[PDB]
Design a protein around this nucleic acid. Structure first.
Ligand SMILES: Nc1ncnc2c1ncn2[C@H]1C[C@H](O)[C@@H](COP(=O)(O)OP(=O)(O)OP(=O)(O)O)O1
Ligand SMILES: [Ca+2]
Ligand SMILES: [Ca+2]
Ligand SMILES: [Ca+2]
Length: 341
DNA sequence: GAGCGATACCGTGA
DNA sequence: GATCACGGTATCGCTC
């Protein structure tokens, strides 16, 4: 098949540049400001000016301020970015019926029945870049190959404001030459683990024994790497359904008493139901971060949808089951809702 | 032995 | 004891 992947470049920061173009050319750091100390939280996305001096997603805000104290630090306006993204997504819908909206900044197009070769696909990509830039002033990066993974790899390599093809010859080279840590889905935990056997390339997952791999990284990820290494990865471009909506919050002081926790928990439910909008969940989970920072979760699934009032009652029962079963104190508390109608 | 959904930890940034 | 959101996924209980 022929797959076309489009990533929005440094998306949260870019949208802020578009909404305030003065920021263009200066370093921009969109952060989540979270907890107790002022400037606590983490960096969500940096533009390239900021990534040049070390500021990147996931580092603490105060450490970014040590590196670039004069950069523009903005809070996350996730509702804004989602509205922009939903508009770009509707732009991309006019290029095939087979669209997988993978995340707020990414989507996969199956364009097999709309073009016959990579040269036509490529040309379609520039048209998609041009259209998104023209109508929304957002640069994207396109990646094109025989399946979702290598199409995304093509994007990873061409970013930012780029476009790249990976043909079947390149696929074979990359199966031999690319670093597994750079395979999509393979994060740092799993990547490090693959230094057990210093598995550094896809083809290496064929030397090792299947049960060994399985026992280190899990069956799902093992099957995944094998099928790639074998170049018999096919995964249809499907329309995705949201799996989970929720909200966690950080409390001013560690607590263990229901009545001080209840207010944060109810805020989290309120904010969660706001984002749910028309979606009715049948499952709920109370999630709590402990004073030592382990996460602990208890849920219940219902045969029906969960009204807000039931969420309120059940969430308390679930928080109570948390406080009996674990003796530690609680630092953060939230809910997550799942199993939509 | 194995299907099926729930569960709660786990890992990625989809 | 300094991150949130989502959803991945190994396992478990129930069951035939
Ligand atoms: N450690 C983290 N903590 C919080 N948010 C994170 C973290 N890592 C990633 N994110 C979120 C915010 C980023 O905007 C979003 C995209 O992840 P990332 O892989 O950094 O971007 P990307 O592949 O889309 O690259 P680029 O931003 O250059 O387009 O994921
Ligand atoms: Ca991006
Ligand atoms: Ca992305
Ligand atoms: Ca990434």
């Amino acid at each position: 098949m022929i797959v076309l992947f489009v990533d929005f470049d440094y998306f949260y920061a870019q949208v802020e540049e578009v909404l305030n173009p003065s920021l263009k050319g200066k370093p921009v750091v969109v952060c989540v400001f979270s907890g107790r100390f002022e400037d606590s939280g983490a960096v969500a996305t940096a533009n390239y000016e900021a990534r040049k001096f070390g500021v990147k997603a996931g580092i603490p805000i105060v450490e970014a301020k040590k590196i670039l104290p004069n950069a523009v630090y903005l809070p996350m306006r996730k509702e804004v970015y989602q509205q922009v993204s939903s508009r770009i997504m509707n732009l991309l819908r006019e290029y095939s019926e087979k669209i997988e909206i993978a995340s707020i900044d990414e989507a996969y197009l199956d364009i097999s029945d709309k073009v016959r070769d990579y040269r036509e696909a490529y040309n379609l990509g520039l048209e998609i870049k041009n259209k998104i830039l023209e109508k929304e002033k957002i640069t994207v990066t396109v990646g094109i190959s025989k399946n979702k993974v290598f199409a995304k790899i093509a994007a990873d390599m061409a970013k930012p404001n780029g476009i790249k093809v990976i043909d079947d010859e390149e696929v074979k080279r990359l199966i031999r030459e690319l670093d597994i840590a750079d395979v999509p889905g393979i994060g740092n935990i799993t990547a490090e683990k693959l230094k057990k056997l210093g598995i550094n390339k896809l083809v290496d997952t064929l030397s090792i024994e299947f049960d060994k791999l399985k026992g280190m990284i899990g069956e799902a990820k093992a099957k995944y790497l094998i099928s790639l290494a074998r170049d018999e990865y096919n995964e249809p471009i499907r329309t995705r359904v949201r799996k989970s909506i929720g909200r966690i919050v950080t409390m001013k002081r560690n607590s263990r008493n229901l009545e001080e926790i209840k207010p944060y928990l109810f805020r989290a439910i309120e904010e969660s139901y706001y984002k749910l909008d028309k979606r009715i969940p049948k499952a709920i989970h109370v999630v709590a971060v402990t004073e030592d920072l382990d996460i602990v979760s208890r849920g219940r699934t219902f045969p029906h949808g969960i009204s807000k009032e039931t969420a309120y009652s059940e969430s308390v029962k679930l928080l109570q089951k948390i406080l009996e079963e674990d003796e530690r104190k609680i630092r953060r508390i939230g809910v997550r809702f799942s199993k939509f109608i």
